[PDB]
Design a protein around this ligand. Structure first.
Ligand SMILES: COc1ccc(-c2c(C#N)c(N)nc3sc(C(N)=O)c(N)c23)cc1OCCCC(=O)O
Length: 209
């Protein structure tokens, strides 16, 4: 406390189980999905900045940072996008995930594979292909800083983040599974970004250790 615990809607909990328990070797797709979500959040603040330029008072730079940390076994994806309010964070992290899960779970029977997850607007959950726990720190102009967290298992927590303020944006912290540490390696991250994120309209900085 003051930590609020919530149950995932039944379909999202099932989707997370499917992602965690399905044998699927092409795990690298998680990075493309998170970067594309960060790209969308950055387009949103850019669209709002055209009408109201004071939306950029919380930070003018529009970028994506990829931060690996071998000591903590984390891969962090930071964007200075629109960010999420507490309600956005609680409402399936600002999506229609309940309907998207239906169409995706249906498509997986119709011949589709896990790599097509983003076409159903639930690409965020592919983080669970590599992460045993996901922490999302977010700051929206119209709200305070919040930390969302889940190790799956049907629940998630939400608390006010009293940590390092970030002005505006979202930080997706992937606490990697013990067998997924290749995603902490520079050449591996660089290869994935080059393969799946070559035409992202924002600078992508890969931090070094
Ligand atoms: C479970 O799905 C998502 C879960 C989280 C996000 C997210 C991420 C990520 N990762 C991010 N870095 N920043 C933001 S700002 C924001 C908002 N204001 O709402 C988001 N929702 C959002 C997007 C998600 O689906 C988007 C595709 C689908 C679509 O087009 O809505």
């Amino acid at each position: 406390e003051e930590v609020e615990t919530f149950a995932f809607q039944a379909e999202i909990a099932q989707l997370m189980s499917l992602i965690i328990n399905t044998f699927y070797s092409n795990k690298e797709i998680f990075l493309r999905e998170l970067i594309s979500n960060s790209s969308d959040a950055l387009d949103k603040i850019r669209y709002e900045s055209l009408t109201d330029p004071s939306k950029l008072d919380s930070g003018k730079e529009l970028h994506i940072n990829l931060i690996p940390n071998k000591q903590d076994r984390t891969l962090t994806i930071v964007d200075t996008g629109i960010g999420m309010t507490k309600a956005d964070l609680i409402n399936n992290l600002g999506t229609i995930a309940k309907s998207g899960t239906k169409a995706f779970m249906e498509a997986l029977q119709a011949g589709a594979d896990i790599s097509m997850i983003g076409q159903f607007g639930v690409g965020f959950y592919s983080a669970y292909l590599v992460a045993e726990k996901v922490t999302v720190i977010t700051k929206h102009n119209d709200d305070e800083q919040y930390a969302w967290e889940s190790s799956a298992g049907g629940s998630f927590t939400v608390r006010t983040d009293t940590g390092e303020p970030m002005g505006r944006g979202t930080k997706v912290i992937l606490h990697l599974k013990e067998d997924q540490t290749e995603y902490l390696e520079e050449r591996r991250i660089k290869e994935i970004v080059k393969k799946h994120s070559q035409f992202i309209g924002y600078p992508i900085t890969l931090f070094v250790e």
